[PDB]
RNA sequence: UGAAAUAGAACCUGAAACCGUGUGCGUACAAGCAGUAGGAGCCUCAAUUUAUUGGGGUGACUGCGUACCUUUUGUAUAAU
């Protein structure tokens, strides 16, 4: 029972180019080289995906920022006087408003402002 | 126990060889003991001793900046022997005299259960003429079945030996898998018997 | 029995053989559970 | 349409007529054909008997005015490799590859 | 016009008859589920901020769907110690549409 | 002629490496395993009362990020 592997070969190593498209030079045509750019595709995706709900709160906590100064009091500031006042708004949404409506978040920093 | 054949007559087998359980574990390793028992098993490849020439050393070891070899026919070369390369083998195991004797046990007893077995008290054929038989089987309502009987006779075996889904074996000659394989199967009363003593 | 299909081994009977060196995933990948250099990891090997 | 003629086989390697093809890409009927006739180059002898070749295909089996003609498309490619054997110093062998072009012009209006 | 609102360890600006997906619910297609913690209103001009809740307030959603998210591979690679393991994810979701936003 | 002629004799099928041609996008002030997570712009298809989404291509710009195997106490290793 002579089993040839050309046929399972083939797709399978097809599988691996077909998921390394786009990449320079060997890393998208040749497998030996672009076995190994999946695997470390795979590896910065797996890193990355914890990263990026790093990045973005360091991005909501920057724009939050920005608009406690613009009226008033810091960052610092700001979080400790949504928490004395019971706000859950998380920076999330906090960051959407600031950016994108500015009356909101002057009257959201006016009740942070008056509890200390 | 208590079966009815074609005409009516009453006939009553044992139900130590014809009612006793289905123990599909059993029947399994048979079934398949006798499979393995068709192979022939009769292969084999080249060993690296066994490839023609290859005897010198290709290259000295060192130097060269190749890897080194002993043999042109080695299992790493193309056109080289076959590292493990099969020979002839056995394929034939052991069933326990008392395990095929269950076997068969079991496989009767189910066939009765779905309703597969037909008890005829004679199936003979005047003439060595297919369509003789073809016909009785068409009135025996099992167009396509395995024919047991004593004595399979010498016309009968020349009646059945070209319709394609039939078979007419002797009691002593009936296997496990001819049981399982045929969609009906027609024993006379007389084999019904022999399987009554033997099993 | 019911068909030459629907013949089953009977659960627990049969096991499926070790294969030694076929990959990371099957757990017997690159050695066969042989360890590293040494005399019992050579080809021909014995506990004498 | 697109009239096309073929020159498999020109015993030259396709690197040395890729730069004679880039002259003619796109050129009309005429300004390619004074291009080919004056380069100095092996590899125009051949990108212009198949220019002409194919100029020939339009007038005769398409009956199509070639005074509109233009080179609408031209690709070289690599035939067949003759390989040989170069004999160098201390007795070693190295293999040569005679390379061969296939020749691809199509023109139209 | 728009609310804020707690869904699925996750909070949410919304507006009206907007496609909203969140985690998984315990919900039929077309039930509708009223979610009456709302942490912040703005109608217009008017701020209703919750400490934590605004009372009274409230947004009536109905669960158009429940689906899976796109596949991802996950893959585990330790160097120079034979040892790789690739899995999928598909995270499960719920489409809302955010019927009304009562005050 | 043939059903078929990118079945035309190097002739069934015709993969990959490798080499061209065309189209779309990006690219000539910017430093590194060449990806990944974001992401503007552009191009192209399907709906939709008409740029609003969805699919596809590209990837300006930002963050992070020194291949794989083997052997090792320990390798991006300038160790195999």
Redesign the pocket.
């Not at chain 1, 498209?21 to 497998?31: E, I």
């Not at chain 1, 695997?39 to 995706?45: E, L």
């Given at each position: 029972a002579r089993v040839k592997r050309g046929v399972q070969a083939?797709r399978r190593?097809?599988k691996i180019?077909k998921r390394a498209?786009?990449?320079?030079?060997?890393?998208?045509?040749?497998?030996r080289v672009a076995v190994?750019?999946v695997?470390?595709?795979?590896?910065?995706?797996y890193?990355?995906?914890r990263?990026?709900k790093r990045?973005?709160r360091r991005l909501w906590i920057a724009r939050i920022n920005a608009g406690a100064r613009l009226n008033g009091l810091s960052y610092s500031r700001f979080i400790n006087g949504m928490k004395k006042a019971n706000i859950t708004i998380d920076r999330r949404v906090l960051a959407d408003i600031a950016m994108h409506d500015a009356a909101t978040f002057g009257a959201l920093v006016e009740k942070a402002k008056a509890e200390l | 126990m208590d079966l009815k054949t074609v005409t009516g007559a009453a006939v009553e087998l044992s139900d130590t060889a014809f009612g006793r359980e289905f123990n599909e574990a059993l029947v399994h390793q048979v079934v398949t003991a006798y499979l393995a028992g068709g192979r022939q098993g009769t292969r084999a490849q080249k060993t690296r001793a066994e490839v023609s020439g290859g005897g010198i050393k290709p290259w000295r070891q060192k130097g060269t900046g190749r890897a080194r070899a002993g043999s042109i026919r080695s299992p790493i070369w193309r056109g080289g022997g076959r590292a493990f390369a099969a020979k002839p083998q056995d394929w034939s195991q052991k069933v326990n005299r008392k395990m095929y004797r269950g076997a068969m046990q079991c496989i009767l007893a189910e066939l009765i259960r779905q309703e597969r077995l037909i008890l005829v008290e004679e199936l003979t054929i005047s003439a060595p003429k297919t369509k003789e038989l073809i016909a009785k089987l068409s009135e025996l309502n099992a167009p396509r079945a395995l024919i047991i009987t004593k004595e399979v006779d010498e016309n009968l075996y020349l009646a059945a030996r070209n319709i394609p889904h039939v078979n007419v074996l002797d009691t002593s000659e009936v296997d496990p898998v001819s049981l399982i394989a045929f969609d009906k199967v027609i024993m006379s009363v007389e084999a019904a018997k022999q399987f009554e003593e033997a099993l | 029995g019911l068909r030459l299909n629907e013949l089953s081994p009977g659960v627990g009977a049969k096991k499926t053989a070790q294969r030694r060196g076929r990959g990371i995933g099957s757990g017997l990948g690159?050695?066969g559970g042989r360890g590293?250099?040494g005399q019992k990891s050579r080809s021909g090997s014995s506990i004498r | 349409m697109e009239v096309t003629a073929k020159l498999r086989?020109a015993a030259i390697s396709?690197?040395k007529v890729?730069l004679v093809?880039?002259e003619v890409?796109?050129k009309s009927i005429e300004r390619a054909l004074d291009i080919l006739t004056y380069s100095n180059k092996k590899g125009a002898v051949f990108v212009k008997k198949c220019l002409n070749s194919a100029i020939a295909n339009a007038e005769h089996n398409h009956g199509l005015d070639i005074d509109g003609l233009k080179v609408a498309?031209?690709?070289?490619?690599?035939?067949?490799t003759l390989k040989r054997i170069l004999p160098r110093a201390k007795g070693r062998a190295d293999r040569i590859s005679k390379r061969?072009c296939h020749i691809?012009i199509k023109v139209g209006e | 016009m728009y609310a804020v609102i707690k869904t699925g360890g996750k909070q949410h600006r919304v507006v009206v008859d907007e496609l909203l997906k969140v985690e998984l619910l315990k919900a039929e297609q077309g039930e509708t589920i009223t979610f009456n913690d709302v942490l912040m209103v703005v109608d217009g001009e008017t701020v209703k901020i919750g400490q934590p809740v605004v009372d009274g307030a409230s947004v009536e959603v109905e669960v158009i769907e429940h689906g899976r998210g796109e596949k991802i591979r996950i893959v585990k690679?330790?160097?120079?110690?034979?040892?790789?393991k690739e899995q999928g994810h598909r995270q499960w979701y719920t489409l809302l549409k955010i019927k009304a936003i009562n005050a």
């Open positions: 083939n190593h097809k180019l498209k786009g990449y320079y030079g060997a890393r998208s045509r040749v497998y190994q750019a695997t470390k595709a795979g590896q910065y995706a890193r990355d995906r990263n990026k990045t973005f | - | 690159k050695t590293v250099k | 086989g396709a690197q890729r093809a880039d890409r796109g498309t031209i690709y070289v490619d690599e035939g067949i061969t691809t | 690679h330790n160097r120079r110690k034979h040892y790789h």
